[PDB]
Write a protein that binds this DNA or RNA. Structure first.
Ligand code: CA
Lengths: 66, 66
DNA sequence: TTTTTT
DNA sequence: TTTTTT
C-alpha cells in the first residue's frame, strides 16, 4: 500500500498518473478507481424511467440509459 | 414506465430534463440515474493504492480517494 | 453534481 | 474514459 496525490488525469483517454513522494509516478487506468462514479446524462441520451411526484413537481425515478 | 431523450443535463447543478414525445419535460436529479457512474480522479486528490505489474510496467490497483 | 428549464 | 507523462 502506498499514499500519493493525483498528478494529472485525462477523462478522454481514461488514465493518468499518481505522484508519490520520493518515488516514480504511478500510472492509473480508470478501471482501478474505487468508489461510486459520477452520475450524469448526455444531451440526446435515450432513457427509460418511472414518473413519481415530489413536493416540487414530477420527476424521474429509475433512469436507465438505453 | 416511459421512454424519453435527455434534453439537457447540467453537471454543476446535478440535474436536467428529459423530453418525452407529446408531454412535458420530466425533471431528473442525478441520484435517480442507474448504472455505474463515470470513474475519474481529480488533480491533487490524495489516494491510497497497491502496485501491480502489467505487461507495460507498474500501475496502480485498488485506488481509493482519501 | 444534492432537487423543477436551458 | 479502455492502458504509461500534462
Ligand atoms: Ca427562463
Amino acid at each position: 500500500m502506498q499514499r500519493g496525490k493525483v498528478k494529472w488525469f485525462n477523462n478522454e483517454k481514461g488514465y493518468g498518473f499518481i505522484e508519490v513522494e520520493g518515488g516514480s509516478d504511478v500510472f492509473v487506468h480508470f478501471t482501478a478507481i474505487q468508489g461510486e462514479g459520477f452520475k450524469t446524462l448526455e444531451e440526446g441520451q435515450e432513457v427509460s424511467f418511472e414518473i413519481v411526484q415530489g413536493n416540487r413537481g414530477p420527476q424521474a425515478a429509475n433512469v436507465v440509459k438505453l
